[PDB]
Design a protein around this ligand. Sequence first.
Ligand SMILES: [K+]
Ligand SMILES: [K+]
Ligand SMILES: [K+]
Ligand SMILES: [K+]
Ligand SMILES: [K+]
Ligand SMILES: [K+]
Ligand SMILES: [K+]
Ligand SMILES: [K+]
Ligand SMILES: [K+]
Ligand SMILES: [K+]
Ligand SMILES: [K+]
Ligand SMILES: [K+]
Ligand SMILES: [K+]
Ligand SMILES: [K+]
Ligand SMILES: [Mg+2]
Ligand SMILES: [Mg+2]
Ligand SMILES: [Mg+2]
Ligand SMILES: [Mg+2]
Ligand SMILES: [Mg+2]
Ligand SMILES: [Mg+2]
Ligand SMILES: [Mg+2]
Ligand SMILES: [Mg+2]
Ligand SMILES: [Mg+2]
Ligand SMILES: [Mg+2]
Ligand SMILES: [Mg+2]
Ligand SMILES: [Mg+2]
Ligand SMILES: [Mg+2]
Ligand SMILES: [Mg+2]
Ligand SMILES: [Mg+2]
Ligand SMILES: [Mg+2]
Ligand SMILES: [Mg+2]
Ligand SMILES: [Mg+2]
Ligand SMILES: [Mg+2]
Ligand SMILES: [Mg+2]
Ligand SMILES: [Mg+2]
Ligand SMILES: [Mg+2]
Ligand SMILES: [Mg+2]
Ligand SMILES: [Mg+2]
Ligand SMILES: [Mg+2]
Ligand SMILES: [Mg+2]
Ligand SMILES: [Mg+2]
Ligand SMILES: [Mg+2]
Ligand SMILES: [Mg+2]
Ligand SMILES: [Mg+2]
Ligand SMILES: [Mg+2]
Ligand SMILES: [Mg+2]
Ligand SMILES: [Mg+2]
Ligand SMILES: [Mg+2]
Ligand SMILES: [Mg+2]
Ligand SMILES: [Mg+2]
Ligand SMILES: [Mg+2]
Ligand SMILES: [Mg+2]
Ligand SMILES: [Mg+2]
Ligand SMILES: [Mg+2]
Ligand SMILES: [Mg+2]
Ligand code: NA
Ligand code: NA
Ligand code: NA
Ligand code: NA
Ligand code: NA
Ligand code: NA
Ligand code: NA
Ligand code: NA
Ligand code: NA
Ligand code: NA
Ligand code: NA
Ligand code: NA
Lengths: 57, 153, 198
Amino acid sequence: AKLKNHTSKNQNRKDHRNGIKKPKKSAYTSHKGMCPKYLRNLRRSRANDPRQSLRPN
Amino acid sequence: THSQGYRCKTRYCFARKFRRHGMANLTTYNRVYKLGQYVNIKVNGAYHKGMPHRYYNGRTGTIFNIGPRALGVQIQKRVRGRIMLKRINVRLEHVHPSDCRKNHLERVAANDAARRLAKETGQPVPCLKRQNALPRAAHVVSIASAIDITPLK
Amino acid sequence: MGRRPARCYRYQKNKPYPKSRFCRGVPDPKIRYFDLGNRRAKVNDFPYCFHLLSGEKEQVSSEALEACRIACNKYIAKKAGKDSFHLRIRVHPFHVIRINKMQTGMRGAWGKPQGTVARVSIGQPLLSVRCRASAKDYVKDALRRAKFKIPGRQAIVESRNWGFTEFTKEEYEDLRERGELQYDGNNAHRISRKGPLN
RNA sequence: AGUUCGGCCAUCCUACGGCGGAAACUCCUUAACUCGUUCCGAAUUAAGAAGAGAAGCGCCGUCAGGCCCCGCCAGUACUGCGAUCGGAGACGUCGUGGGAACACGGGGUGCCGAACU
RNA sequence: GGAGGCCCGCCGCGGUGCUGACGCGCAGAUCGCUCGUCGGAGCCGGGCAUGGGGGCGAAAGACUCAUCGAACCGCCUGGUAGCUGGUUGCCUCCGAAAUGUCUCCCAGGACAGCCGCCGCCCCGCAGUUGCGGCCCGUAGAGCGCUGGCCGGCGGGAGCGGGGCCUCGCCCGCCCCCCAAACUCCGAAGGGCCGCGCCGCCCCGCCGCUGGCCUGGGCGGGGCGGGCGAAUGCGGGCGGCGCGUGGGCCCCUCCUGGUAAGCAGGACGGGCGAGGCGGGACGAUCCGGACGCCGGGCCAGGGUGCGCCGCCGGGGCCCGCGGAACGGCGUCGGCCGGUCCCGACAGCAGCCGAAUCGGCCGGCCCGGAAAAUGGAGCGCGCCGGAGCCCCGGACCCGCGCCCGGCCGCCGCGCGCGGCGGGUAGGAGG
RNA sequence: AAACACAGCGUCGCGAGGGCCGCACCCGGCGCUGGCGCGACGUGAUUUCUGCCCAGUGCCACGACCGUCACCGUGAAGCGAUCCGCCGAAGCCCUGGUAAACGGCGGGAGUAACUAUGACUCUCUUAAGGUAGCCAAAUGCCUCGUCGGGCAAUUUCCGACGUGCAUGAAUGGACCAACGAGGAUCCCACUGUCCCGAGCCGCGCCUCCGCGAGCCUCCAGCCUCGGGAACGGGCGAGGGCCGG
RNA sequence: GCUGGGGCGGCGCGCCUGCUACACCGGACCGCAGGCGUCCCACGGCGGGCUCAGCGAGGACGGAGACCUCCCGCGGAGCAGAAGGGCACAAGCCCGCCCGACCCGCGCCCCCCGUGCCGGCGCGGGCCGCGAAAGCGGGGCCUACCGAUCCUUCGCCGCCCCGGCCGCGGGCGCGGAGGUGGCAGAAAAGUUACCACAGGGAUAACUGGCUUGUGGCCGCCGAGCGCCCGCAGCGACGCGGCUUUUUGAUCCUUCGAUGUCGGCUCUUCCUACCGUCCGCGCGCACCGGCGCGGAAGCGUCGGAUUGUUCACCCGUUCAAGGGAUCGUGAGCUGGGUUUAGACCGUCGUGAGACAGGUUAGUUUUACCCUACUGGCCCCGGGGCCAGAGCACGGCGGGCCAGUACGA
Ligand SMILES: [K+]
Ligand SMILES: [K+]
Ligand SMILES: [K+]
Ligand SMILES: [K+]
Ligand SMILES: [K+]
Ligand SMILES: [K+]
Ligand SMILES: [K+]
Ligand SMILES: [K+]
Ligand SMILES: [K+]
Ligand SMILES: [K+]
Ligand SMILES: [K+]
Ligand SMILES: [K+]
Ligand SMILES: [K+]
Ligand SMILES: [K+]
Ligand SMILES: [Mg+2]
Ligand SMILES: [Mg+2]
Ligand SMILES: [Mg+2]
Ligand SMILES: [Mg+2]
Ligand SMILES: [Mg+2]
Ligand SMILES: [Mg+2]
Ligand SMILES: [Mg+2]
Ligand SMILES: [Mg+2]
Ligand SMILES: [Mg+2]
Ligand SMILES: [Mg+2]
Ligand SMILES: [Mg+2]
Ligand SMILES: [Mg+2]
Ligand SMILES: [Mg+2]
Ligand SMILES: [Mg+2]
Ligand SMILES: [Mg+2]
Ligand SMILES: [Mg+2]
Ligand SMILES: [Mg+2]
Ligand SMILES: [Mg+2]
Ligand SMILES: [Mg+2]
Ligand SMILES: [Mg+2]
Ligand SMILES: [Mg+2]
Ligand SMILES: [Mg+2]
Ligand SMILES: [Mg+2]
Ligand SMILES: [Mg+2]
Ligand SMILES: [Mg+2]
Ligand SMILES: [Mg+2]
Ligand SMILES: [Mg+2]
Ligand SMILES: [Mg+2]
Ligand SMILES: [Mg+2]
Ligand SMILES: [Mg+2]
Ligand SMILES: [Mg+2]
Ligand SMILES: [Mg+2]
Ligand SMILES: [Mg+2]
Ligand SMILES: [Mg+2]
Ligand SMILES: [Mg+2]
Ligand SMILES: [Mg+2]
Ligand SMILES: [Mg+2]
Ligand SMILES: [Mg+2]
Ligand SMILES: [Mg+2]
Ligand SMILES: [Mg+2]
Ligand SMILES: [Mg+2]
Ligand code: NA
Ligand code: NA
Ligand code: NA
Ligand code: NA
Ligand code: NA
Ligand code: NA
Ligand code: NA
Ligand code: NA
Ligand code: NA
Ligand code: NA
Ligand code: NA
Ligand code: NA
């Protein structure tokens, strides 16, 4: 008793049913895989800037 | 059979072009890249480190990471009914800068220049919008015509 | 006969399947001679040419090719002498056909080699004949005799060219009366105008 | 004009003839020292200045091979969409869009940049 | 004289054959003929003994109260079942999947996809074209590379056959034909990205980077300018949960097979889960996708009569599924000859104008065969009621338009749009 | 029934403090027995016979203790739990016996004054290479083997033949008088088995008086072709048909 | 376990290359041609130097090849093993020094549910190798070469043994090794012809349907045969069709059952015609034969052996082929096939097996609807006719005549 092995017949219609979802607008600015030396320098420059430092007083 | 090794079905896309074998020219190493720049992906088959998968050949993306020897490129990939953002590391032999924005940059520059020019002289500003080809206008042509006929079989 | 009827392999249904390192145990074709008559004959003699064209897209077995060769050659040789014509078979049997011999039915039914056929398109010449004015009175009857061994529908034509060359008779004769022809054992070519001198 | 260092990597390559050197480059001379050759100062390392355009190099030529551009090939081959169009089939046709290749003919045969003489 | 697991034969004890009767029986095993044995390892009655994975067996897995390859009674026990059957009122709003991965998985499940309900937030969108950048090696083409394959003609250093000669191997040119696992070339077709903020000046921070007063990144402050393709149109996110996981058909493109209403794949559509008209007749073909009604217009298909609806004009003309191959059936062509200087058919005489050969096309004829009597739907028609073409009409699917009413969703609260549905979900 | 039993034949174990079996325990049977006995197996009257193989598996050694193989015991070390040695019953291993134990029992070449065959030679090879017999058998694939008998004519039957797919010696071989509701072939006699059917008797059936059920049941009950889950009563098109 | 039924066979049951695949990606088959479960302290890292295969010519104990020299040499060599890519002052060959074939911690790509596993890549620190230096180095140029929880064993540094302390011992946090190839990973031999259970037309064996390879029948062509003479009769090498009376292929309907071979009996139908009828042809004198067209009315038999269909033989008035659920079991029969008893041979340790042989083995129900055969539901005597049915074929003898014809 053999049954079907494979079909992609209806798959493109199912994909378009609710549109093709775009990624989130925060995935474009993640620090997920950035060079660590660059990230460390960015942190220290912000903290020492009086106009953008969040340190209290 | 059906096996899906990392480099399956690459007999033609990874081969070198005709009479373009050997080492790459040195311009591929001393050009400057910046964060946010658009680049193209083209695999070079003579360089086996930092090589992307066959799927990414012929796609365009932006730079998110500048490394000591490799770049980080963001690419949009469709998977079923959804788009995923993929981040890959590529060596310099497989990446070229992209001219997908050059037309827009030149249009912006020209628009600003023309806006400046007419203001100083006060001339009216023309239309700075692209037009899709409009139908032709009225005109007059001369006749020195040649009779055309259908030939025998 | 021991062979399937020719209707089982009439049409071009598969991709070309030549004999190579992948296909090995192939029997020898039935036809081995493709040039008959007076092959050695200067282009000067034998001015008239006839073609048996193909009006079908199909496959022709090597047995049919052998039969047609024998029939046409025998007739023309008997009627007008063995040295008045040159006959060329213009198609070769490069395609291999398979058989699934009949336990297991459709399971594992890939099939073994059996024979060879030629693949021909519409309008493609199948035979060509060169002759002088002596045998031109029977060339067409030889072609009609060979027409009955080939599947389908064929047409007989008389070419306007000179023999097997690419020149029309008018152009050939002019270029001969203007001294612009390099001559070979069968064919003629225009004189060269490029390369070094001397 | 030359040399050093480069960019693009044959319109720059290959073969065969010819022309040229003031300066430059080159070929050239020597083996104490330095370093060197499965053996060899051939190569390479060091030290020179009697010779030379004979090569390399720069330029010219060839009904030259190659490489490059334009035409023709040809709206042909093939093809997207529509057709109760023809045909037993194999295949073809019409409407509406896109559109080659080989072959052949004509012409061409390195520029660009920074420093010194 | 009278022995014998001797012989014929009655009652008894058995149970051969008719494969007889009966087979809703007289009967949950009987009846009739025929048959085996009949002093013996014979037959019959009563009492007693052996008990369930046990007994008993001249052995057939036989018998053990109509029950035996493991009795019967009650209880554990309403034992378990991915498997078969059934599962009870109405209306309204939405509405699938037959696919991917894993599974002692393949008649089942989990996770993902598709769908319903419940929400929440306020941040421009698109199964489209145009313009700009980049990617691919398929059809075709070809023989330069990797392979394959007919011959012709020239040169001979070297080598062989044969008679310093004559053909061969080798070198050159020319030439026939080729490739899913060949490619110097290469479409149609596809894919990805972009199409508003820009320009100038100055200032701050860095523990990164540079020979430096270099860079890069992140911020602040002033000046000028501005919304720079078309078309359409509001967008995004979360929670909980069901069904489904045997599919099939059409178009175009493929693979195995002689082929198949065969088996296996691909873009788009359909049936499933789509009413209605037509195709005589059909789940899928041609049109058209549905609340209840009145009127109008008309798609697809047709208009002798059954059976709603037709005429006019031009041409052809013996209607089975069907091939190679034949035809002097008729109509229409193309290319060649001969001909009043007399052709063709019966050099000259007789006549007195067309004729001869080849290659086709349209509609026909032959090739053309099966089993109950029968199907261009039937009856029939046939200078049509057949075939091809041109023109003007007609018939009818509430499909489309106009008007009335019902419900749902919206709303400048005046009105506007819409209405199919299996499995499944929700409201009254 | 050709199956089982059977007389006969053969093998094996046991001398009582034993053997075989029952059985939860206590206790039992053979056994009121004692080798001319009891128990366990195979073959299956008579006649004539019963060949070779102990490599495999099985069984047996009042054979041997080689190696291995327990607890216990004992020695050393340790704070102790422990650990390391020695010691070494049966069994296996080792050495022998046993086929009326289970079972098994060969290939290729050459060769004699016509041909043909092969008494004979060579060669590989086993634990041993199927002996006496028997056979197209209830056992032979090819096969309806070949020859003979019997018939007008025989895939049946009988007699021979034999490199026998895959016969064979108490898993018994060969033969056999008497016996058999056993399987098979032929001859005489006899006949409705048949050519080829005919006539008759009784009971049922059938009609009547009395009595009086079961099974089954979507609905219904005439055909041909088409299409359709590919063989329709219903559907499309035709042809027929009062009702009971 | 998969599986064009199951079994036997095979292993697309974990992975890799090229093709199938129709120019992004993806894409099936017990599709095609193949490969893997390894090998190497150098066959690894780095630096330097060099250029390979080979053509041509020359050197000669020396030859079709040893070794030497020059020339030109785009790779035609080599780089561990499949195939496809890549590589020339190199990724190849030779030489020198070395061990980055290291330690700590993160992220990404491929397959994909965007989970795991194998494999790869990019980084931040530590310590190193080579090189003048810039640089390069986490193995063998790239695409394959491998493995969870629980348990055991080993290694560094520490923590716990809960009334305390000390010494042994046990446990715990991190990382390796011991293995699951059916590779997301149970610990597992047969047989049932004494047999079951739940289901299945999701799936075989018998009818029917599509197909027609095979079987059967028929055309076209004309190399030849036929004393000579292609076609009286034949007809090679080839090519085109038809049929469903053979056998295959497939799995659409039927497993809450359509009684599965042959014979006997009885009816009807086909034609692709064997005898008889009517024509024509012959290599047709007569007799007898052979070929073709129309034609399905009648005929196509009795026996021996076999269950047989078939086959084979004897005989005769000389003896075609088929269909109808492979017509016909509430018509029979029961020889065969195909339950349960029993035997032989071969096979198996055995229970048992055998498209090998042999013998013995219950064949149930019509009263219902229709169809069919007859018969009824009264009406005078004698006739006619629509419609329906339908029935004379074959073989001899006598005369013609021992004639025509023929030696
Ligand atoms: K019991
Ligand atoms: K599954
Ligand atoms: K080539
Ligand atoms: K006995
Ligand atoms: K022994
Ligand atoms: K035997
Ligand atoms: K005889
Ligand atoms: K008996
Ligand atoms: K199947
Ligand atoms: K049995
Ligand atoms: K049947
Ligand atoms: K035919
Ligand atoms: K059934
Ligand atoms: K029967
Ligand atoms: Mg499935
Ligand atoms: Mg045939
Ligand atoms: Mg195929
Ligand atoms: Mg007595
Ligand atoms: Mg007696
Ligand atoms: Mg009876
Ligand atoms: Mg009865
Ligand atoms: Mg007991
Ligand atoms: Mg809806
Ligand atoms: Mg498992
Ligand atoms: Mg092609
Ligand atoms: Mg299911
Ligand atoms: Mg199908
Ligand atoms: Mg359904
Ligand atoms: Mg639908
Ligand atoms: Mg009407
Ligand atoms: Mg609705
Ligand atoms: Mg419902
Ligand atoms: Mg013997
Ligand atoms: Mg025998
Ligand atoms: Mg005998
Ligand atoms: Mg016998
Ligand atoms: Mg007899
Ligand atoms: Mg034996
Ligand atoms: Mg014996
Ligand atoms: Mg025996
Ligand atoms: Mg019915
Ligand atoms: Mg009806
Ligand atoms: Mg299975
Ligand atoms: Mg998998
Ligand atoms: Mg190097
Ligand atoms: Mg580091
Ligand atoms: Mg698994
Ligand atoms: Mg029935
Ligand atoms: Mg029944
Ligand atoms: Mg006929
Ligand atoms: Mg019946
Ligand atoms: Mg029987
Ligand atoms: Mg039996
Ligand atoms: Mg009646
Ligand atoms: Mg009548
Ligand atoms: Na007696
Ligand atoms: Na039994
Ligand atoms: Na119960
Ligand atoms: Na309809
Ligand atoms: Na006795
Ligand atoms: Na045995
Ligand atoms: Na891997
Ligand atoms: Na089925
Ligand atoms: Na049949
Ligand atoms: Na039957
Ligand atoms: Na019956
Ligand atoms: Na009655």
